Amino acid sequence: PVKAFGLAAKDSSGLFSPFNFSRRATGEHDVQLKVLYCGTCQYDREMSKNKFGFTSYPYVLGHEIVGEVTEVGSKVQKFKVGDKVGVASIIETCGKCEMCTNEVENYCPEAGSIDSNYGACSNIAVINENFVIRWPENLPLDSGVPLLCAGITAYSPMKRYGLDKPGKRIGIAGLGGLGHVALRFAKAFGAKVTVISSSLKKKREAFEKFGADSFLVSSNPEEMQGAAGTLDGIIDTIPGNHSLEPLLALLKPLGKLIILGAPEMPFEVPAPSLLMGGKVMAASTAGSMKEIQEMIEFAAEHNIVADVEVISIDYVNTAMERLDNSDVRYRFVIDIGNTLKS
Amino acid sequence: PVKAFGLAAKDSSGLFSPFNFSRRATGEHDVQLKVLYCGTCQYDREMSKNKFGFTSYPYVLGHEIVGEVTEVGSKVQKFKVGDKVGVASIIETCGKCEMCTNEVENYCPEAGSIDSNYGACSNIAVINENFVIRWPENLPLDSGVPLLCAGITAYSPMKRYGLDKPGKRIGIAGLGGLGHVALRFAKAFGAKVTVISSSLKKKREAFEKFGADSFLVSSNPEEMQGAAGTLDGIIDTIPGNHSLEPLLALLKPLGKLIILGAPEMPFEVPAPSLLMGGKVMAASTAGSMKEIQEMIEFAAEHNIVADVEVISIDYVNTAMERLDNSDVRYRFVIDIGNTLKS
Ligand SMILES: [Zn+2]
Ligand SMILES: [Zn+2]
Ligand SMILES: [Zn+2]
Ligand SMILES: [Zn+2]
């Protein structure tokens, strides 16, 4: 019913092009919004090329969204026309399951992603009110929008596994985009932060602007050994193949390794690397609506943003190529509001 | 100073023989005890043959101990002559570290095991009072003694990771020496218990003798898929090589797999097997003195014992051989008090 336009790919090459379609009318509990900025990452490139078998074409990307409310339904009280809002990857769930009723609905077995019925790299989106967040006034929209993907991904497990308290010794493994964001949250929580990287080229970048308290080169066995058994937890953001044994060795007994990337090679985990000290390894995906709300207010309070490269709608194909397996520091953010046209 | 006798091995063959030695005099904070029953397990056989490189000869086994107090030091108030007591694997720690001061001293980097300075398959032992537990009156000494190794091993992580509440759906993988004990704790906590086993030979036992609420054959892919995403946690007691993927698939989102065995082959863990649902895997060794005390009183309250085969001192070599095959139903317990002589 409501006319819309955006970018879509016709096949698994992942090449996007201008695409007309339509969205539903603003129902009783829905929020229509004009999209202002569309944050972009690996997920988009992988979905565009059907990496996981479940993409259907034509495919419109867009899972990290900030925008301005254009309509609200008759029952919607939380939001009004003109409000700045955010939308994350998950926009519907079943509502009945244990994960849904305990407000950890990001883990609903039947969770529906925003890009399944056309993503929001598009002029307008329409989203059920319970999956929209009120954007804080003190947070920029362009450099803030990636907090809805990278930010929540780090934030959720940091809260869940108690890696969020002053004086915790927290490792960050990998310092791409995702790692930079996780690092900024760890600092804001008042943690003593160690960056673990495979190269000295990253040391200055780690230390900059009241960042890391320590830096470990993972290929230096003297440094890694010196830090054995010292960390309360590690946020592992490394996207490609790596061993978990050297990270597990940095943990204190009972410490926690949180895995956020999805490397192709399975991890090899000798039982002793967990048994010695009763260590924990856990993974995590995205976060709940309650967590995203708490997360974005915390970002605002502590002035946390992502490093971004802002782009026009024309540059999306080239960006896709460039972000592929790169976990780039300056996350590509599309200025939908100013550059997308009919 | 105080004359003692026991069984010791001379070399890494693991062959034990009668052995005279001596212990220290009962110091100000020590408890001397006559050993009544010495619980035995895989650790003893592996230590006897130097499997891990740090056994020194001559070697006296004995890490699961119940006994009668024969002397107490001038400062000891908690215990008196004639009291029934228990002693576990760990009998000293550094006292200064974070793990020591937070009463999780089983994870002390400098923890000293009872068998390092002659184990307690011997007529007498002398132990610092802070590493002795008061044996509850309603628990049998012979069938209770393995609770100090197997019982605490299951109990500690079940408390730590919240797998200890009524209505929790808890899997028990492996139904042997350690599993049968873990099963009994899960039942006592009021859990709905699923036994996961590689063979139908164990079904009737699981139901009739352990009151499992469900049984899964791990080599039946229809059964395993039917139980996908149903368990709050799994206690994995399987001692030899196995994959964790089928166990992780049984867990609810955010569920926990607790690993207690030490298989020789590393676990192969694809990132998706943890990422899909934000699952946790953790290992654990033994438990603290606070945990063992709480554990043994809970055992007594809920009438939890191990299934034991009692043996005389002369049978220890044969018992040890039989442990290579786990050829026991389900633990060997040495009657030290009645069968060990000068
Ligand atoms: Zn993203
Ligand atoms: Zn649901
Ligand atoms: Zn034992
Ligand atoms: Zn210590």
Numbering used by the authors:
A (entry chain B), B (entry chain A): 14 to 355
Question: What does the report in the manuscript say about this coordinate set?
Answer:
THAS1 and THAS2, which produce predominantly tetrahydroalstonine, were both crystallized, since their amino acid sequence identity is relatively low (55%) and the predicted active sites have numerous differences. Structures were obtained for THAS1 and THAS2 with NADP+ bound (THAS1, 1.05 Å resolution; THAS2, 2.10 Å resolution) and in apo form (THAS1, 2.25 Å resolution; THAS2, 2.05 Å resolution), while HYS could only be crystallized in the apo form (2.25 Å resolution). Mutation of other conserved ionizable residues in the THAS1 active site (Tyr56, Ser102 and Thr166) did not result in substantial changes in the distribution of products. Mutations to Glu59, which anchors the NADPH cofactor, resulted in a slight increase in product promiscuity, perhaps by causing a shift in the cofactor position.
Crystal structures of THAS (here referred to as THAS1), a second representative THAS (Cr_021691, THAS2) and the structure of the promiscuous homologue (Cr_032583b, HYS) were solved and mutants revealed key residues that control the stereochemistry of the product profiles. The HYSs perform a single, chemically straightforward reduction reaction that immediately neutralizes the reactivity of strictosidine aglycone/cathenamine. The active site cavities of the HYSs are framed by helix α2, the catalytic zinc coordination sphere, and loops 1 and 2, with the NADP(H) co-substrate binding at the base of the active site.
